[PDB]
Amino acid sequence: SLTFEKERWLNTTKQFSKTSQELIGNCIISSIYETYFGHLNERERGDMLVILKRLLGKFAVKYDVNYRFIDYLVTLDEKMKWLECGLDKNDYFLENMSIVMNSQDAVPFLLDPSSHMITVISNYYGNKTVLLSFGFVKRLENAVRFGSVVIIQDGEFFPIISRLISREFNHAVTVEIGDHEVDVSGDFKLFIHSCDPIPIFLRSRVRLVHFVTNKESIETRIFDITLTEENAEMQRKREDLIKLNTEYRLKLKNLEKRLLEELNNSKEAMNIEKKLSESEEFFPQFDNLVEEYSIIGKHSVKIFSMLEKFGQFHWFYGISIGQFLSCFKRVFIKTRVDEILWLLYQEVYCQFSTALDKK
Numbered sequence: 001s002l003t004f005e006k007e008r009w010l011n012t013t014k015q016f017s018k019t020s021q022e023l024i025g026n027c028i029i030s031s032i033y034e035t036y037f038g039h040l041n042e043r044e045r046g047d048m049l050v051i052l053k054r055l056l057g058k059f060a061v062k063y064d065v066n067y068r069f070i071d072y073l074v075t076l077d078e079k080m081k082w083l084e085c086g087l088d089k090n091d092y093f094l095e096n097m098s099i100v101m102n103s104q105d106a107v108p109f110l111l112d113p114s115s116h117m118i119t120v121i122s123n124y125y126g127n128k129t130v131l132l133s134f135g136f137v138k139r140l141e142n143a144v145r146f147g148s149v150v151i152i153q154d155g156e157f158f159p160i161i162s163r164l165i166s167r168e169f170n171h172a173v174t175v176e177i178g179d180h181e182v183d184v185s186g187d188f189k190l191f192i193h194s195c196d197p198i199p200i201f202l203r204s205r206v207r208l209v210h211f212v213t214n215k216e217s218i219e220t221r222i223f224d225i226t227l228t229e230e231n232a233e234m235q236r237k238r239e240d241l242i243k244l245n246t247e248y249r250l251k252l253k254n255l256e257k258r259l260l261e262e263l264n265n266s267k268e269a270m271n272i273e274k275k276l277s278e279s280e281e282f283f284p285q286f287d288n289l290v291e292e293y294s295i296i297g298k299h300s301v302k303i304f305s306m307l308e309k310f311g312q313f314h315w316f317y318g319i320s321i322g323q324f325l326s327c328f329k330r331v332f333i334k335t336r337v338d339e340i341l342w343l344l345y346q347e348v349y350c351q352f353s354t355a356l357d358k359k
Contacts, residue, residue: 022063025061026064028063029063029069034207038099038210039208040210041214042216076249087120092220096211100121109192110192110194111197113197113211117193129148130143132151132152140161145182145185147186149190150188150189152192158199169184215305218301222328225329227286230340234286234289241279241280241282244272296340327348327351328344331344331348
């Protein structure tokens with residue numbers, strides 16, 4: 001009966017070294033991600049990750065090929081509770097949220113002309129949200145001595161919160177603001193959201209978080225929708241992989257609880273690992289499908305950029321990204337690749353030639 005427990009202990013002891021090596025490699029990757037990967041789109045960030053990984057291979061330091069900081073930091077409950085607060089289910093939104101919630105040492109900048117980050121953070125915070133826009137010194141001092149979370153607008157007209165933002169607290173823990181001594185209740189959080197794309201000192205104290213979509217976002221959206229609705233086998237294997245990951249996390253939590261109970265009172269893991277290894281063998285299929293369905297993505301970027309360029313020649317010819325996503329959905333809601341690109345062209349023409357003059 002103890003043979004299975006001994007085998008599990010031996011497997012854990014053997015995998016501890018690989019876990020530690022992957023931990024330090026993934027920590028390098030994650031830190032360099034929240035620093036140098038917060039203001040660039042997907043294509044150049046992919047090239048930069050390629051160069052970074054080839055330099056790491058020159059250094060030859062052990063890491064994880066399937067590295068994902070999303071499961072490293074954000075659990076499922078936190079991800080759902082943040083997705084219901086206003087944010088989408090997209091990966092870029094999840095990762096910049098992770099950058100925001102990991103920016104403890106330097107205040108997390110909220111660059112959003114659409115002002116969605118301020119709304120979602122206020123919805124998450126609740127009653128503690130206090131909004132200002134750059135009297136105001138007295139309001140900030142009152143908020144500091146009260147203990148409410150402060151979000152300040154109009155970041156382009158900012159130099160009086162230097163000590164507070166640099167945490168120059170004086171302990172006997174006091175805050176020096178203006179020309180008087182102030183106190184901090186301890187529940188103080190200072191955040192900044194703006195809409196105007198910044199002084200160099202402000203850049204130093206903040207970590208830049210980007211929101212603006214682009215043609216890289218177009219490629220990401222078309223790839224996601226293709227993998228999510230084009231191939232039902234892809235949908236079923238993605239659902240099986242997600243369920244297997246959730247089951248593995250639940251089994252790890254149950255095993256930890258069982259170990260704690262055994263410590264207090266003094267098979268399944270192998271099957272879960274085998275199922276996970278069997279399910280994670282479809283990554284090359286996803287890569288091949290992405291390679292096949294990439295000319296459609298390039299043509300999609302070309303079409304969207306062209307339609308944006310028609311808006312340059314006349315101010316009454318705007319093009320909507322939501323409309324483009326809707327028509328991409330509509331061409332397939334009702335040679336597979338050649339036929340689907342042909343139908344996408346026909347649908348886009350027949351739906352976007354109704355809003356143009358004859359010329």
